[PDB]
């Protein structure tokens, strides 16, 4: 199952100035780019068109091409309706659908960072917790059935006829396996007489990876997973362990990943390899983090 996300960010500075940029993610792979400077939607993968013909695509691109202008020009009128709301304003649209032959499509809209409006059923909707000054704007937008129609088309039927196309298209790219590379280091802990043992993992795909510090068969419970970090399209992760200075020895960073095939990267703290590498990377230590 893969969540297909259409992300649009629109910034209005004042009466005159406004810009809109958009990105498209399948799973966690960028497939489409659209710049306020650019006139046509850019492909970012050699399969981002999906199982759609040029005619099917040009018509859809045109559909959004008209939308971009229309959207900008609508908002700045909605502002004119409201002394109520003031510039500068930040519009964030989050469309898409998750594929399970079952799908759940969604269209969420966020105002100034807070999510306030969504599309539901056959119209736009305010949420629970939303402010009441967003009501008249909704009543104005729900008057247009013609738009409300064309949205439902894309949500109810078009997205999955498209997404199921992409999955089938980029099967080889989405299934690509990458070997993680790993190394160790240490930093003085925020505590007295302690040491944090960084273990680095870099360059793997897909995302799900397993890292644990070990004393043989024993999993070290103070192992702290980092947050995944992006690199191209690969993944970076680090797993820390706080140790009482003098316990460094006998430990090991173990990395399990689908691309290894039951043959894990195992890094022993204080092995000839660790000694040799940690030397290859010495430095003056200014400016280190406080």
């Amino acid at each position, epitope marked *: 199952n893969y969540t297909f996300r259409c992300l649009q960010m629109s910034s209005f500075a004042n009466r005159s100035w406004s810009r809109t940029d958009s990105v498209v993610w399948l799973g966690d792979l960028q497939t489409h780019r659209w710049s306020n400077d650019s006139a046509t939607i850019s492909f970012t993968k050699p399969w981002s068109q999906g199982k759609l013909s040029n005619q099917q695509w040009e018509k859809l691109q045109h559909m959004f091409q*008209v939308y971009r202008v229309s959207f900008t020009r*609508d908002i700045q009128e909605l502002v004119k*309706m409201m002394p109520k709301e003031d510039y500068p304003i930040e519009i964030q649209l989050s469309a898409g659908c998750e594929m399970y032959n079952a799908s759940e499509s969604f269209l969420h809209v966020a105002f100034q960072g807070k999510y306030v409006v969504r599309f539901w059923g056959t119209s736009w909707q305010t949420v629970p917790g939303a402010p009441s000054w967003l009501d008249l704007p909704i009543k104005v937008l729900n*008057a247009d059935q*013609g738009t409300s129609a064309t949205v439902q088309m894309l949500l109810n039927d078009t997205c999955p006829l498209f997404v199921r196309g992409l999955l089938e298209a980029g099967k080889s790219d989405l299934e690509k396996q990458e070997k993680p590379v790993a190394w160790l280091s240490s930093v003085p802990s925020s505590a007295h007489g302690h040491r944090q043992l960084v273990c680095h993992v870099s360059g793997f795909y897909p995302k799900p990876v397993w890292v644990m510090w070990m004393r043989g068969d024993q999993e070290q419970q103070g192992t702290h997973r980092g947050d995944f970090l992006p690199n191209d399209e690969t993944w970076y992760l680090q797993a820390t362990l706080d140790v009482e200075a003098g316990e460094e020895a006998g430990l090991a960073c173990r990395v399990k990943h689908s691309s290894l095939g039951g043959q894990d990267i195992i890094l022993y703290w204080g092995s000839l390899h660790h000694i040799l590498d940690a030397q290859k990377m010495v430095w003056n230590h200014r400016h280190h983090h406080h």
Partner: T-cell receptor
Amino acid sequence: AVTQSPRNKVAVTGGKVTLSCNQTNNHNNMYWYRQDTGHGLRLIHYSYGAGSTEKGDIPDGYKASRPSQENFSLILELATPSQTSVYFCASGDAEQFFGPGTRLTVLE
Amino acid sequence: TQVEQSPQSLVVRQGENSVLQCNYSVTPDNHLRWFKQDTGKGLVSLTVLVDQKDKTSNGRYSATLDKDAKHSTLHITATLLDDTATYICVVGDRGSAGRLHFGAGTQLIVIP
């Protein structure tokens, strides 16, 4: 129905002309237009509701004002010979309903 | 000009057909109203066309629309004298409370 007063007006260059417009159809959007030969109607000012004014396409020389929902006025601060035309007032909730039109002649 | 009307002036012998044209280059194009202006008076809405390819009738007036060409046409069958007016073609760009687009209109003179 939409009603405009005055219906006809002769004004002097640099004079202060005002064209009041009225409707009791309980609308919210009100528009001012200018008609000149070989042109078609052009928007001058418009209002999304009470206490609101918004510049249209040709707003230079004109000020709009809305004190109530029912009424919408257009002010020519310094009248110009270049502003001799027929002015229309419309309204909507879109189905725009138009008024009888005012003939304003501005002379030197 | 954003919206063009043909001809400038059509002249018909009372009690015959009369076709008036309208071409627009406006996007997006929600609908199209035809108006009727009695010389020295307001505008009166004859008919409206919303669909991609639309056809409609009202009295002797019957109008057509094809958005695949962004084009309109107004037919009046068996013209009366009291039809001598200007007919203006008006395009609506959004189906919500949007700015209308006005053609220069067509003055229709009917000879008896």
